Structures are given as C-alpha cells and as structure tokens.
Amino acid sequence: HGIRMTRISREMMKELLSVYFIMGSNNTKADPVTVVQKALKGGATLYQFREKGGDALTGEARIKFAEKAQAACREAGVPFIVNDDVELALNLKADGIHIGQEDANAKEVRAAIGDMILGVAAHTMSEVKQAEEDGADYVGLGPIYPTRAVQGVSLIEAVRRQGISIPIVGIGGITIDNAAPVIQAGADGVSMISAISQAEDPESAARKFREEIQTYKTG
Numbered sequence: 001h002g003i004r005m006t007r008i009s010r011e012m013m014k015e016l017l018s019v020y021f022i023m024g025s026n027n028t029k030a031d032p033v034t035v036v037q038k039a040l041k042g043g044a045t046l047y048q049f050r051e052k053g054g055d056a057l058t059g060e061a062r063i064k065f066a067e068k069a070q071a072a073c074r075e076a077g078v079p080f081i082v083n084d085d086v087e088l089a090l091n092l093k094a095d096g097i098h099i100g101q102e103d104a105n106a107k108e109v110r111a112a113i114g115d116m117i118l119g120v121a122a123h124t125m126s127e128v129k130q131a132e133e134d135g136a137d138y139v140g141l142g143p144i145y146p147t148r149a150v151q152g153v154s155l156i157e158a159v160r161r162q163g164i165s166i167p168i169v170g171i172g173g174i175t176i177d178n179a180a181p182v183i184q185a186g187a188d189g190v191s192m193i194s195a196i197s198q199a200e201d202p203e204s205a206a207r208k209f210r211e212e213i214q215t216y217k218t219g
C-alpha cells in the first residue's frame with residue numbers, strides 16, 4: 001500500500017473491511033501499540049487510529065503514538081486509517097481517513113485528501129446515498145449492537161435491497177459471537193474495538209474473527 005494515484009476499487013476496499021480493528025490508548029489496559037501489533041499479527045485487515053475523549057493522548061504524545069501504530073501497520077502490510085483528524089492523516093501520509101456526520105463535510109475532506117481511502121459513518125439511507133456522491137470509498141453503518149440508537153442489521157439490509165453496492169463495514173458492539181449476521185445481512189466486514197482491544201489474547205481474538213468472517217463471506 002503506497003501513495004494512491006487512483007481511487008481504491010470496491011473489490012479491494014471490500015477485502016480490507018473484513019476484520020477492521022479500531023483503537024485508541026484508552027480502549028485497553030495493556031500497552032496500546034503492543035495490542036495493535038497483536039491484532040495485526042492475528043489477521044486484522046485494516047486498522048483505524050482513533051484517539052479521543054477522556055484518557056486520550058494529546059499534542060506530541062498523540063502524534064508519536066500514531067507513528068508507532070502506523071509503523072506496525074507497515075510491517076504487517078495492512079492499511080493505516082486515521083479517524084476525524086484530516087490534518088494528521090495527510091501529515092503521516094496515512095492510507096485513509098474516517099469521518100462521521102458531525103465531522104468535517106465529506107466533500108471538503110475528499111478534495112483535501114486526493115485519492116486516499118475515505119470512510120463515512122452512515123445511520124440512514126439518506127446519509128448513505130449522500131456519502132456515496134460525496135466520494136466516500138466505504139461507509140460504517142450502525143450502531144448495530146449496544147448514545148446513537150442501535151439498529152441491528154436493518155439499514156444494512158435496506159441498503160442492499162435498493163441495489164446499492166457501496167462497500168459496507170458494520171460497527172457497534174460486535175463480538176465474535178454476533179458478527180456473522182452482520183455479514184449475512186450483506187456487510188463486507190465488521191468493526192470492533194473492545195472485542196479485541198480488551199481480549200486477554202488480542203492476537204487469537206483477531207485470528208478468530210479472520211476465520212469466521214472469511215467463512216461467512218464465502219457462504
């Protein structure tokens with residue numbers, strides 16, 4: 001994964017969303033970077049640097065943590081995605097950026113990031129359709145499981161029913177036990193934080209997701 005000179009293809013984007021690990025320093029009791037390295041070693045196909053909130057790093061501390069996470073993604077050969085922060089995404093030459101409905105407008109972000117990967121969080125058919133024309137390469141629908149209202153795989157099913165094929169990754173309380181339906185509903189992958197970041201064995205946790213997700217995408 002080098003500097004993209006063209007928009008990422010749906011086939012390649014969908015392969016990456018399979019097991020999508022999201023994590024910040026405050027989502028685990030162990031060593032942040034060490035957990036990420038294990039998640040990759042395990043089988044995670046994409047990672048998103050998400051550092052914000054209460055016990056979250058700031059200033060230089062944050063940036064360096066990001067560089068280490070990105071470095072670990074490099075070794076594993078997995079794309080490094082940044083959350084919210086467009087300025088940082090561009091500075092670290094990250095593979096992508098993810099935004100929600102309250103973050104910078106997708107149109108602007110797309111113009112500022114060139115052909116970088118762009119993920120947009122959607123919650124309604126409208127937001128999905130908008131994300132697509134705004135130039136998003138994929139959308140994160142949810143929260144599927146238990147603020148924003150839980151929606152199961154209803155939206156995911158509505159999107160596929162309208163024939164829309166945009167890459168989709170599910171998000172929200174996803175565990176190894178409830179991930180299958182998300183896929184069966186038509187999602188191209190599942191996103192998780194605690195299911196892996198808080199596992200006593202993150203590496204094996206990521207490995208289980210990898211096996212399950214591949215099994216269900218085939219069937």
Ligand SMILES: Nc1nc(C(F)(F)F)ncc1COP(=O)(O)OP(=O)(O)O
Binds near residue numbers: 048101169
């Ligand atoms: N971070 C996210 N990542 C995904 C992804 F698709 F990547 F799985 N989907 C949805 C969200 C939620 O985005 P948002 O509401 O902006 O809040 P926050 O930045 O606090 O997560």
Ligand SMILES: [Mg+2]
Binds near residue numbers: 083084098099100103
């Ligand atoms: Mg956000």
